[PDB]
């Protein structure tokens, strides 16, 4: 069970209960994580990474807990941020390689074909990249990496339908190598296309779950 949360609670100001009684269980599949912007999906992803500490409940990432074991557990994990921002002075290939070897190596054979079919130019500086080409850097860096768990967060933002289809096919290819995926989409069409066993959260709680 890569992810097993039940009972999660967190107050930020200690006037804003973001999390009360949150639940989630993943087992080797693709899981949809649905809810509004203020419902606490970002807080849950930021607690799964060591970034934020929880006030209560059990969080169980790959056996260990996310707070103390935040360095040993992060080398089987890839992450795609919701708001992708890059270093302006580095090229696309430089950013891809840097990110890939700060998290446990890269696969060059997969990287070459991913660059070939996302149609990226890994020589322009990241300052010149458009909205669509900025997302491709993160997607290529995450999809070409030793990772038994992918934490995507709005993975396809700014991508035309062709690159959407390519990304869906890549996720489908990854799913049968034993890679567990979290989508957290905001676009229910791709969630319906890819994921089974969605979970819908309203305020801090999970109001619905299942296939």
């Amino acid at each position: 069970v890569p992810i097993e949360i039940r009972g999660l609670t967190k107050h930020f100001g200690s006037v804003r209960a973001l999390d009360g009684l949150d639940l989630t269980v993943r087992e080797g599949e693709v899981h949809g994580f649905l809810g509004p912007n203020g419902a606490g999906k970002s807080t849950t992803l930021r607690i799964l990474l060591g970034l934020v500490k929880a006030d209560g409940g059990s969080v169980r990432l790959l056996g260990g807990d996310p707070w103390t074991d935040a360095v040993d557990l992060h080398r089987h994990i890839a992450y795609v941020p919701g708001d992708v921002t890059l270093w302006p002075s580095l090229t696309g290939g430089e950013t891809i390689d840097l990110l890939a070897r700060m998290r446990g190596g890269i696969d060059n054979a997969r990287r070459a074909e991913l660059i070939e079919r996302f149609g990226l130019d890994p020589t322009k500086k990241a300052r010149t990249y458009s909205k669509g080409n900025r997302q491709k850097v993160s997607l290529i860096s995450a999809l070409s990496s030793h990772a038994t768990l992918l934490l995507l967060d709005e993975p396809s933002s700014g991508l035309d339908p062709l690159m959407e289809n390519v990304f869906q096919q890549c996720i489908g290819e990854a799913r049968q190598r034993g890679v567990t995926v979290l989508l957290s989409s905001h676009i229910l069409a791709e969630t319906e296309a890819l994921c089974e066993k969605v979970t819908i959260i309203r305020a801090g709680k999970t109001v619905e779950s299942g296939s």
């Binding site: 930021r46 990474l49 060591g50 970034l51 934020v52 500490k53 935040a70 360095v71 992060h74 080398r75 992450y79 941020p81 708001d83 921002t85 270093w87 002075s89 580095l90 090229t91 290939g93 430089e94 891809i96 390689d97 840097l98 990110l99 070897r101 700060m102 998290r103 446990g104 890994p122 020589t123 322009k124 500086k125 300052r127 010149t128």
Partner: protein, 529 residues
Amino acid sequence: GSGFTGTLGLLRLYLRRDRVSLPLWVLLLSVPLATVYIASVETVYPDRSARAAAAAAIMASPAQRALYGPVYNDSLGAVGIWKAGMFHTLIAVAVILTVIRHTRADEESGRAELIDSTVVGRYANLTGALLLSFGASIATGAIGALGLLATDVAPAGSVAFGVALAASGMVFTAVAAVAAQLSPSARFTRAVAFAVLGTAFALRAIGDAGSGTLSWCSPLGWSLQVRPYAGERWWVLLLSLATAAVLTVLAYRLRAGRDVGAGLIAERPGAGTAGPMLSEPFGLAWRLNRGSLLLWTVGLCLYGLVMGSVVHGIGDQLGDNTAVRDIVTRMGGTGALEQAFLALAFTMIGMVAAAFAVSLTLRLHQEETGLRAETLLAGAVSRTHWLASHLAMALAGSAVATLISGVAAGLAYGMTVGDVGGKLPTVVGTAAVQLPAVWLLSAVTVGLFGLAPRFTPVAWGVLVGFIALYLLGSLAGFPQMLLNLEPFAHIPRVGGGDFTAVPLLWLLAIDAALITLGAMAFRRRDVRC
């Protein structure tokens, strides 16, 4: 519906966007003339016989003539306005930034395609920025002229200096407007404009230190050949105005054959993979900081080289209780003024190096608030392995920008005297003993980043708060207990006796403790974004 529609609305928008940054550099560049330069010169040099000596002293030192320019007579205005010759440079800097802030770096951000989709003309943005910069330069010139007219100088020279200061800003407003059309990158255009300004300054300095014919070939240099207080050459002014006019026209032409997004220069590709040195939050910090280290190091080395020559010559062409044997004897080494002046001069370099060390540590706050620290720390990077890669850069960069300055000053002093193997070790030690004070404001900044990140920039206000205690406590009244709250006063003095080395330990311990608390309080802190 013209091509200039919406010019006043855009001008109003540009005033609001910097309603606080503009008055600061308009006033801070014009009012501290009649209250700082002429007043201090009148205090130090009371009568004519004490001013002819100073003018003749300035005329026998190219290292000091090239930085500020010549002095043509010994009147109160001409001697008191000499060190103000740097203002002509500073104002240029200011106007350049302003233009590149409002024309480029506004297209690059994407806002000047949203603005151009409203009811605005093609040339409204450039015209608004030009109006803002020209008005700012004229305003600072007028305020400076009024302040100078409120003193005891020639009334016909204050006007000349004010007009020269205004024209030197208008010319570089024009050059910045021309440079803004050249590349899609704001950084590139800033580099081009500053390269033009730097070559103008160098071409001016070479001519001032020598015959003087070369200085006619630089927009800086036309400003100080007007010769206020020394017989004014008015016809020089319409030799700058004309230049500005031409450049302005050129700017518009370069806009008439350009698209809104970008134009006229392609950028450089070149790195498809990461070399064996970009794999760590230590290599990435080196990539992000190397340019600023180069810039600051060159500036500090050049300033130290300038100060090294002056140290000998002050011992003779100053002193005799000309009202300097009272403040130098307190702030400085309390003895041989050749060493007191050195000790006093290296405190300024220490303050500049502290300002340098503050920036490389605010890089940490910039990284976090830009949502990239989460990207870095979501990998297999320890939370203290990061934040040890900007601290190391800050410490080891401010520790070399000061030692190189000390080496340059020692070399200049040794060559000036003739013996270099005696002065060099002492000057290097004087530069070195300033490090414990410079490593605060890095320890302090780290302490703030980890207990209250949002109040990280107030580390600037601390630094200035220290400087005001050094000057306004030793230049004015003091209880001797309010002056013991700054690190630059406790720095011991190398060479001779009364070297104690105890305050160095008390500053190193405070540095280490502040850094330790700022690092321990950060690894139990929710990354706030």
